[PDB]
Design an enzyme around this catalytic site. Sequence first.
Site, short mmCIF file in Angstrom:
data_model
loop_
_atom_site.label_atom_id
_atom_site.label_comp_id
_atom_site.label_asym_id
_atom_site.label_seq_id
_atom_site.Cartn_x
_atom_site.Cartn_y
_atom_site.Cartn_z
N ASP A 185 10.86 7.60 -2.15
CA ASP A 185 10.71 7.75 -3.39
C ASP A 185 11.45 9.08 -3.77
OD1 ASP A 185 8.95 10.35 -3.28
OD2 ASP A 185 7.18 8.94 -3.08
N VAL B 107 -6.82 9.79 7.46
CA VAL B 107 -8.55 10.04 6.87
C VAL B 107 -8.80 8.79 6.13
CG1 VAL B 107 -10.11 11.13 5.61
CG2 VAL B 107 -8.74 12.50 7.28
N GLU C 258 0.68 -1.11 0.06
CA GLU C 258 0.08 0.11 -0.04
C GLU C 258 0.90 1.31 -0.12
OE1 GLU C 258 -3.18 0.36 -0.50
OE2 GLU C 258 -3.65 -1.69 -0.62
N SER D 247 -3.58 5.55 5.07
CA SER D 247 -4.06 5.80 6.62
C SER D 247 -4.33 4.34 7.49
CB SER D 247 -5.25 6.67 6.28
OG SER D 247 -6.23 5.83 5.87
N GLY E 223 -5.98 -0.24 -3.41
CA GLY E 223 -5.64 1.23 -2.79
C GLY E 223 -6.53 1.48 -1.53
N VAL E 224 -6.39 0.52 -0.83
CA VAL E 224 -7.11 0.75 0.58
C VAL E 224 -6.53 1.94 1.42
CG1 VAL E 224 -5.79 -0.81 2.28
CG2 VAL E 224 -8.26 -0.85 2.22
N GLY E 225 -5.20 2.02 1.22
CA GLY E 225 -4.52 3.60 1.44
C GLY E 225 -3.65 3.60 2.58
C1 LIG Z 1 6.54 6.41 0.41
C2 LIG Z 1 5.09 6.79 -0.07
N1 LIG Z 1 5.39 7.97 -1.24
C3 LIG Z 1 4.29 8.88 -1.60
O1 LIG Z 1 3.34 8.82 -0.94
N2 LIG Z 1 4.73 9.67 -2.48
C4 LIG Z 1 4.03 10.73 -2.94
C5 LIG Z 1 2.60 11.02 -2.62
C6 LIG Z 1 1.93 12.06 -2.84
N3 LIG Z 1 0.59 12.27 -2.78
C7 LIG Z 1 -0.47 11.59 -2.48
C8 LIG Z 1 -1.45 12.62 -2.16
BR1 LIG Z 1 -3.18 11.87 -1.84
C9 LIG Z 1 -0.99 13.61 -2.12
N4 LIG Z 1 0.41 13.62 -2.32
C10 LIG Z 1 2.55 13.24 -3.88
C11 LIG Z 1 2.12 14.17 -4.34
O2 LIG Z 1 1.12 14.22 -5.19
N5 LIG Z 1 2.68 15.21 -4.00
C12 LIG Z 1 2.37 16.51 -4.82
C13 LIG Z 1 1.70 16.84 -5.90
C14 LIG Z 1 1.33 17.90 -6.42
C15 LIG Z 1 1.37 19.12 -5.76
N6 LIG Z 1 2.20 19.05 -4.49
C16 LIG Z 1 2.49 17.55 -4.06
C17 LIG Z 1 3.86 12.81 -4.12
N7 LIG Z 1 4.48 11.63 -3.55
#
Ligand SMILES: CCNC(=O)Nc1cc(-n2cc(Br)cn2)c(C(=O)Nc2cccnc2)cn1
Length: 187
Positions: free
Chosen positions: A59, A83, A28, A89, A85-87
């Site tokens: 990443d 709050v 996830e 959270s 693709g279970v997510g």
């Molecule tokens: C280790 C797990 N990796 C991880 O969660 N990586 C991510 C997650 C992102 N997002 C997922 C959401 Br909902 C909001 N941001 C984002 C993201 O969408 N960032 C973003 C996009 C557009 C404007 N500002 C930040 C980037 N990387």
Amino acid sequence: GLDAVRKRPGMYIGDTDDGTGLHHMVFEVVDNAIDEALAGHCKEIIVTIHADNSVSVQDDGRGIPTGIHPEEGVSAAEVIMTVLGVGVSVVNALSQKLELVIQREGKIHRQIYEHGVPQAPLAVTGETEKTGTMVRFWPSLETFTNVTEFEYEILAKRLRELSFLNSGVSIRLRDKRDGKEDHFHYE
Ligand SMILES: CCNC(=O)Nc1cc(-n2cc(Br)cn2)c(C(=O)Nc2cccnc2)cn1
């Protein structure tokens, strides 16, 4: 809500007694990074099995957003992590501890959760020339039984798959318990 997931974890994450759910937790988190790769903003994902019963997924994407809603006083990052693709959270809810570190707009941001509950507001912890998101979590030993440790081959099989399904993404798998490392990337 986090209470709900903690009451019936198997509904959300899969079987908690045979390692299925345990590994789903990792997948996830990885899926969130893959989505950032599919959006064209992440080239490498590093998954590390640490020697203290945690896994980290890092990443090189844009970073989870770090802004605060001025009337609520809660960061976007916190909303994403708490709050339903279970997510992610759900992962947070079923983790005794979870650490989020975001590198974005020249700053490092960090927040710690225990069983999904944030311990302090998202805070700045340094400056950086890099971007991306790191989630590290320690799974709840009130939730998972029998298989409470991460198993390298389960992650390796699936991460290899994810790399060929999302051609161009580099996925690295590292085990701190024995120095084993793999690099999955397909052209
Ligand atoms: C280790 C797990 N990796 C991880 O969660 N990586 C991510 C997650 C992102 N997002 C997922 C959401 Br909902 C909001 N941001 C984002 C993201 O969408 N960032 C973003 C996009 C557009 C404007 N500002 C930040 C980037 N990387």
